[PDB]
């Protein structure tokens, strides 16, 4: 259950901060993605964050301006977006990354602090929130 | 009477059962084999310590020891008739328990040295 | 990081078998078996149709299949239905560890 | 005054002593206490009355109790050591309901657990399931599907238990003194704990004592010959428990009224595991039937005795225990290998003043049990086939006083105490052990 | 003769080897150490039990003791010359086996109660 | 002129008695039985002849053998207890029968098996293979797979073996009585173990006995000096075994004529395992040779002795055993650590009547062997590098007299009776154990 | 007129003898030596007041050394046995560099390494990390990633450790003789094995000896009181070691100046493992200090004594050892349970001739440790949190001479001693044990 | 003097206090439990062997013996004035150790074995 919040209408050069409330899953052991889709356009990957915050990956197209972060206690995913461009107008989505334990040699395999590995696909999408610049 | 049958009798009366009491002094890596050995061995050690004391005193083979050593008058406020006829062994032991070591030491030194010194003096 | 190329649109009659292609590179489609396809109902976030080149999630019918050869991947839709209409997308993982989507394909059922 | 010392050997003198007494027995092959090695018993012990002897000895300070304690615990492990470990079963259990006609008392008591079992080959696992009692199962994760559970102790010391072959019958064991030692016995039935006993005799061996483990009531023990006796170290010290010996047994009929089956799996190389299978017939809760009239008389007598050391115009309330873990809130006992945890509140819900029809006490059944004295070891009780009807005698009680009251009145007593040493206090009150001291000083007239 | 070499000897003849016979009565990953201890302990217990019996009969240190205990003809159908010169100890023991316990009791009781009385009388 | 009963001591009196004996070693690498925990023997425990003594004793009522049995077993376990277990190897095996120019008698006897195995690290799963004898494996499921096999004891007690440096040589051990005890030995030559012996001597220690394990033939023992002696508890009871002590040694030459190569792996933390890899040369059946003429003469003497015991001018015949597994139908023995299961039916394919030529016995080799008289254990016999050839003598035979009221003729004798305790009967039939009772009672004239 | 044979009993005569001594404790509950079976003894010495008997005895003849040695090893196994095996950790270990302000001479000493691990459930594996010392980690495959390692002893006997409560405090143990035996203490403060001891006082119990085990410099032992004494089994034998007992203590201050974190995980069912965590502050080499004066001038006393075994105008050199295993190459001691290895490069370098400034030695830390004399077992040394500092007393040296010298000069000595027993030889040098033989015979005249 | 107080002294002087020497002859799954049982057994068997031997020699209960067995010249190169007055027991025992068995055997055969026979013959 992913619920985006913080969308609104801003002027060019402004900053906006999104958050995604979440429930139904051990947020703290699973990775997350931000995806955006401009009206009339296809899906654009924005960023990925590992469950423990150890690795972050951002699209070249959003570098500098967008930054992915998370709060394990809040069970919340965030997107900090600065110096906003009109090109950044899009519906932004909170997406849970599919994952679980690798099965090898009749055993399951966890990542550090019993983390879930990335099955490599999206599973749960929120409704999305519109960000207009 | 059997073992301790005379336990409440006077000390004099009970002397007739000393043999009876003597008869009752003598008779796997998990918790039973070792315990039995410990019990058996200790029973033997207790037995032998008393036998050694009797031996050093010149009481080997005797039911009753007899020596030439007097006891201390400070150890008694009683005459022999009271001691033998109006008291039992449990009572008596309590009455004189603090003099046990003293008398054993006196009996051993006094008679062991006198008897062996006489044996050499009277050897021929 | 560029988009994966998809046909702008595909179409066919009900019951028709159609294919939606996706053209990537050696750093993604020809790099791992980590490819996947999504179906986006207009106005909604998309659902997984395919993952790992050809695997279906529970709830997806066997009319949805696919394959991967070299740097080119595709989604096969057999028995095409009007209910299938939507925007189809390919996705892949990269050496940079970034996620990339294709341009998307519009599906029309005749 | 011109007198000399003689020494008599074979003198009838006693000294308090602490030594080991040995296991004596009449003689199936494997019992926990009636073990392979135990020494045949004297068929004719010689009890010798002692004329003119008064001897004082203790209860509760009596080390014979301590000796049984250490040996019963150590032996429990030695006899039950070579059992199949249940470590291989510590996997997640997928839990659902029981497909039967389940009564209202039994709702929630049983679970049907499904898991991937280890087989005797290292290359194989199989789908298996078993039934468990609720008391032994814990939820693995509210965050994940609330259908996954674990055995209660897989995150602590491993549970080990098989040995279906071992007898748990509480066969009484006699204890015998080594040569050089003697056992004194008190025949004064009116003694109240520690003090001089005017009526004594001696023995070579004690009578046999049945190793019955209990947390509240004393079953199949020594019965008082005349009247109910209440004994304690200090009647005003509520930190101490109360021993009540009855002069009449109370018959109690306990059951686990379900026809059970047993299933098993080979886990490893002869590493067999047995578990609860399905149930034949419907599902009903365990219970015990205590005669109401007998019980009423039983506690009435207890009150008459309480009033000897406590006064009148006091209402004596009997109440259920105040709380604690299962072992101290229920009456725990073993019936043929089955472990019962019975609710005795029905026995302690009344008052007495100074001026058939049974009690169908509900019971629970538990299988993963920690040793009474520690949690570093635990066992999984094997399942038992069929239906059990357990019949025993209540020969006593261990009670706790609700100490502290306004104007020293309207006292309340509750059942309890899980300390195993308290279950031998009655049987051992009659005995003391002494060393024989054959030499004595004999002042006289010879040279 | 060697140890137990007197087994076929007559009771009288065998009386000449008694010192030998008496001398020879006396001597960690395995459980064998326990059985070895048991064997040694038991040998001691058997030895001591017999020694105490001899001692209580007034035989401490004596291979042979003369006592004061008479006995019934019901316990023998033989004269002393047959008993000592023709018979062996093995056969003899069998022939009078059922009187063993009786005699041991008599030897102790009929000698010690009387010796005790003599010691008291001999005080004056 | 009256008599008094006096005290004697040092008296030469014996009583039948039971106790244990001490292990005495004669003239390092530890041998399974000739253990480090065994005190060196008396180089000359000189026996003494007893003048004018006849004594009776009865073999089979003799507990010296029972003591030997328990000790040979306990030592077997003390030695094997710290060895590497084969449990990690209880995996499915993919088995075929690739051999290098195998003869016809051997077809199907050897199997070429591949399997998954571990190494010292838990993540390094590797492929391994070895050769097995057919007798050691079973198809887990033929229907699922033609080649899927498993080891015969993986579904029961774990198979264990390592300790390659242990010697299984039956090194003789002498046994000594404790102080207070002595052993009477029979020096007669025509004597059977039950009844009076007119010629005896006393000893403290027995001769050394080789702890030979065998099932049909009594090998490497003490030969009769004059005549064949046949011993039985009840000579006409066909439910009992017959001991035949020969006065003629018979030599037997056994071999495994295959130059097997031994390979080894590590399974876990120093957990070494040894197995046959390839085999040098072609494949031939194991076998034992005896002289035909010697065996024929041996039986002729046995036949005469049997007639002495039964009817005159009668017919005696021989046959092999009436089925059962190898442990009871073949002659089972060990040499070099390997076990042999030889077909002895050719030694019994003869009849007798009232009025260079050799025998070859084919043999089987087995490596997974259960315990002597137990089913709670399994052992793996490691291979011996190279070719093994062993020579030993037959000292005696174990016979079974078949039943049927066949008019006291055409009696059939068979091999069988492979109970280890019956083997040792052939050595201790000459000994009696007694307690020494130095205390004597007798009348005389004194006071 | 002639003489007669007389037996005297209670004669004060000694016989050389061997038996064992009892463990006698004096004033966390249990340690290898603080054994639970050990009997508190009487602190009062049992002297014979220098009774004037001369007796010759020596070292390297003294079997008590062997007993101390064997008892200690047995005790180690007893405390080491009931602990967690570390076998579950023998997995592929993934290593990279620790990057925390490492000082240059510490580069390569520490490894940051990841691995998979077992957990509470048997069908689950998790990722875990720890910090390791380089010495115990070995690379497994140049052909594969240069990051793959294993623990040094996973291919041999399992490494085990737990029981963190238990310490290794070398608590002194006193040893007592059984009745019938006596211990002879040499009161000569200036003796050697080259002759008899003129002053001996026997005791029933010895003083306590601390089981401190060291490889080169003996710590916390008995110091000589009057002079420096050098002892050897054979003073001219290059194959023997040299024991130097100093009469001057040398203080040594050791440290591991690195602030550690101890972390722990569950390996299995109540099976805990402790390991090195985050080190905070700079990474620095462990080291030990002595002052120059107390080492350099102290050795001159050693030299004066060496010159008594060697000739006059002889040049003496000290040097470093030839190497070999770390166990013999470096100084080694344990403190806090941690095992320290130190290179005595600053101690053995200078040459002695006929005619505030400190010394610091570098040290290293090791955790996977075999026993000095055996590799059939291995133990793991647990981490210590925070910073550890230790101060010890050097009481003696174990030196090794080179293989002779040219024309009795430039005699070179190196640190040495490869025999664990040297640690007790150095303490028991003052004692001998005899048996009491109370019977004897002498001529006299009597009856 | 205490235990071994005169061990290095004159044999005669050292015979004055033999009582201490006698007293010092007499007094958990780990190897210490095993050693304690073994040691206790050892002490007991040794003690008993000496007592048994004293019994054979007719020295029960004595510290000082007397016999009918004469001293052999091969056993000594000294007078009593040298043996008892000018040397220790340790040295003495070292010098005559070769005769331990012959002496003991002679005492056994010539002392109690012969006296006991003579006593039986003096019965009437
Ligand atoms: C009936 O009784 C006879 C004796 O009367 C037995 O005869 C011999 O018994 C031995 C022991 O069982 C046979 O085996 C020998 O074992 C030795 C073991 O020593 C070490 O070295 C081996 C090396 O492979 C290690 O495996 C082992 O652990 C030890 O460390 C071998 O060394 C012997 O081989 C060498 O010596 C023999 C001569 O003795 C030479 O011929 C060999 O070429 C080689 O140099 C040997 O293997 C021995 O084979 C028996 N001899 C015969 C003729 O049989 C009978 O075994 C016994 N039979 C039965 C059934 O009980
Ligand atoms: C009974 O109680 C009284 C009072 O406390 C006490 O003095 C007496 O010794 C007790 N007697 C027995 C046998 O317990
Ligand atoms: C209580 O009543 C009984 C009679 O039933 C009497 O003997 C006893 O003394 C009374 N006790 C008190 C404290 O009044």
Tell me what the structure shows:
It is classed as viral protein/immune system. The complex is a heterooctamer, with 1 copy of chain A (133 residues), 3 copies of chain B (124 residues), 1 copy of chain C (110 residues) and 3 copies of chain D (447 residues). Chain A is an all-beta fold and 133 residues long. Chain A is built from no helices and 12 strands. In chain A, the strands form 3 sheets. In chain A, strands 3, 4, 5, 8, 11 and 12 form a 6-stranded antiparallel beta sheet that branches. In chain A, strands 1-2-7-6 form a 4-stranded antiparallel beta sheet, with no helix packed on it. In chain A, a hairpin with a 4-residue loop joins strand 6 (66-71) and strand 7. Chain B is mostly helical. Chain B has one domain (1-124). Chain D has helices at 63-79, 292-309, and strands at 4-9, 14-16, 22-25, 39-40, 48-49, 55-57, 93-96, 110-118, 125-133, 137-139, 148-151, 174-176, 181-186, 195-197, 200-203, 217-219, 229-231, 242-268, 271-280, 286-291, 316-318, 331-335, 338-342, 350-352, 358-365, 368-370, 378-380, 386-401, 412-415, 431-436, 439-444. In chain D, the strands form 7 sheets. In chain D, strands 16, 17, 18, 19, 20, 21, 22, 23, 24, 25, 28 and 29 form a 12-stranded mixed beta sheet that branches. In chain D, strands 2-30-13-15-5 form a 5-stranded antiparallel beta sheet, with no helix packed on it. Chain D has a 5-stranded antiparallel beta sheet with strand order 9-8-7-11-10, with no helix packed on it. The two termini of chain D are 14 Å apart. Chains in contact: A-C, A-D, A-G, B-D, B-E, B-G, B-H, D-E, D-F, D-G, E-F, E-H, F-G, F-H, G-H. The B-E interface holds B 15-16, 18-19, 22-23, 25-29, 33-34, 37, 40-41, 44, 47, 60-61, 63-64, 66 and E 31, 34-35, 37-38, 41, 44-45, 48-49, 52, 55-56, 58-61, 108-109, 112-113, 115-116, 119. One 2-acetamido-2-deoxy-beta-D-glucopyranose (NAG) binds at residues 191-195 of chain D. The site of one 2-acetamido-2-deoxy-beta-D-glucopyranose has 3 residues of chain D, from loops.
Give helix and strand order of chain C, one letter per element, not per position: EEEEEEEEE
The figure for the number of domains of chain D is 1
Q: Which structural class matches the secondary elements of chain D?
A: mainly beta
CATH architecture of chain C: Sandwich
Bound molecules: a molecule of 5 linked components (NAG-NAG-BMA-MAN-MAN), 2-acetamido-2-deoxy-beta-D-glucopyranose
What is the SS-derived class of chain C? mainly beta
Strand content of chain C: 35-45%
């Amino acid at each position: 259950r992913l619920v985006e919040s913080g969308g609104g209408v801003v002027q060019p050069g402004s900053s906006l901060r999104l958050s995604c409330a979440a429930s139904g899953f051990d947020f703290s052991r699973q990775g997350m993605h931000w995806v955006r889709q401009a009206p009339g356009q296809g899906l654009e990957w924005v960023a990925f964050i590992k469950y423990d915050g150890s690795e972050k990956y951002h699209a070249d197209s959003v570098w500098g301006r967008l930054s992915i972060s998370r709060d394990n206690s809040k069970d919340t995913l965030y997107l900090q977006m600065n110096s906003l461009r009109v090109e950044d107008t899009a519906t932004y989505f909170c997406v849970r990354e599919a994952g679980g334990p690798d099965y090898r040699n009749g055993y399951n395999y966890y990542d550090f602090y019993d983390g879930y590995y990335n099955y490599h696909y999206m599973d749960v999408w929120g409704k999305g929130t519109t960000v207009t610049v | 009477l059997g073992f301790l049958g005379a336990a409440g009798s006077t000390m004099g009366a009970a002397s007739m059962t000393l043999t009876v009491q003597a008869r009752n002094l003598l008779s796997k890596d998990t918790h039973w084999g070792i315990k039995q050995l410990q019990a058996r061995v200790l029973a033997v050690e207790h037995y032998l310590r008393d036998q050694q004391l009797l031996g050093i005193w010149g009481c080997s083979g005797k039911l009753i020891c007899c020596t030439n050593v007097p006891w201390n008058s400070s150890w008694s406020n009683r005459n022999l008739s009271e001691i033998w006829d109006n008291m039992t062994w449990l009572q008596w032991d309590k009455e004189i328990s603090n003099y046990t070591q003293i008398i054993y030491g006196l009996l051993e030194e006094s008679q062991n040295q006198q008897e062996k010194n006489e044996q050499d003096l009277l050897a021929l | 990081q560029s988009a994966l190329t998809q046909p702008a649109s595909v179409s066919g009659s009900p019951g028709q078998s159609i294919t939606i292609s996706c053209q990537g590179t050696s750093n993604d489609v020809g790099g791992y078996e980590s490819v996947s396809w999504y179906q986006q109902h207009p106005g909604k976030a998309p659902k997984v149709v395919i993952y790992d080149v050809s695997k279906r999630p529970s709830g997806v019918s066997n009319r949805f299949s696919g394959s991967k050869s070299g740097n080119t991947a595709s989604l096969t839709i057999s028995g095409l239905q009007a209910e299938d209409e939507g925007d189809y997308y390919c996705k892949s993982l990269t050496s940079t560890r970034r996620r990339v989507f294709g341009t998307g394909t519009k599906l029309t059922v005749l | 005054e011109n007198l000399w010392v003689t020494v008599y050997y074979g003198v009838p003198v006693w000294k308090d002593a602490e030594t080991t007494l040995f296991c004596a027995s009449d003689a199936e092959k494997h019992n926990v206490w009636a073990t392979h090695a135990c020494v045949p018993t004297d068929p004719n012990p010689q009890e010798i009355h002692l004329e003119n002897v008064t001897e004082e000895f203790n209860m509760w300070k009596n080390n014979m109790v301590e000796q049984m304690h250490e040996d019963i615990i150590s032996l429990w492990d030695q006899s039950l050591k070579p059992c199949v470990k249940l470590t291989p079963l510590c996997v997640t259990l997928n839990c659902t309901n029981v497909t039967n006609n389940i009564t209202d008392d039994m709702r929630g008591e049983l679970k049907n657990c499904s898991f991937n079992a280890t087989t005797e080959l290292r290359n194989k696992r199989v789908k298996r399931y078993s039934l468990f009692y609720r008391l032994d199962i814990v939820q693995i994760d509210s965050n994940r599907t609330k259908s996954h559970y674990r055995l209660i102790n897989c995150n602590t010391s491993a549970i080990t238990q098989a040995c279906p072959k071992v007898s748990f019958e509480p066969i009484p064991i006699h204890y015998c003194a080594p040569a050089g030692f003697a056992i004194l016995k008190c025949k004064d039935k009116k003694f109240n704990g520690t003090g001089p006993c005017p009526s004594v005799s001696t023995v070579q061996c004690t009578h046999g004592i049945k190793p019955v483990v209990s947390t509240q009531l004393l079953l199949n023990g020594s019965l008082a010959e005349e009247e109910v006796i209440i004994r304690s170290e200090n009647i005003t010290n509520n930190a101490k428990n109360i021993l009540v010996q009855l002069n009449t047994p109370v018959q109690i009929n306990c059951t686990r009224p379900n026809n059970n089956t047993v299933k098993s799996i080979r886990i490893g190389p002869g590493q067999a595991f047995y578990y609860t299978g399905d149930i034949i017939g419907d599902i009903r809760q365990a219970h015990c039937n205590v005669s109401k009239a007998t019980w009423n008389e039983t506690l009435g007598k207890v009150v008459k005795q309480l009033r000897k050391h406590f006064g009148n115009n006091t209402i004596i309330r009997f109440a259920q225990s105040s709380g604690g873990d299962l072992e101290v809130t229920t009456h725990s006992f073993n019936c043929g290998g089955e472990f019962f945890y019975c609710n005795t509140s029905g026995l302690f819900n009344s008052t007495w003043i100074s001026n058939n029809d049974s009690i169908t006490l509900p019971c629970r059944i538990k299988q993963i049990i920690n040793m009474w004295q520690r949690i570093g070891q635990a066992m999984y009780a094997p399942p038992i086939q069929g239906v059990i009807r357990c019949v025993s005698n209540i020969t006593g009680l261990i009670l706790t006083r609700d100490g502290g009251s306004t104007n020293s009145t309207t006292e309340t007593f509750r059942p309890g105490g899980g300390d195993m040493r308290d279950n031998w206090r009655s049987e051992l009150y009659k005995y003391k052990v002494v060393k024989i001291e054959p030499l004595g000083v004999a002042p006289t007239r010879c040279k």
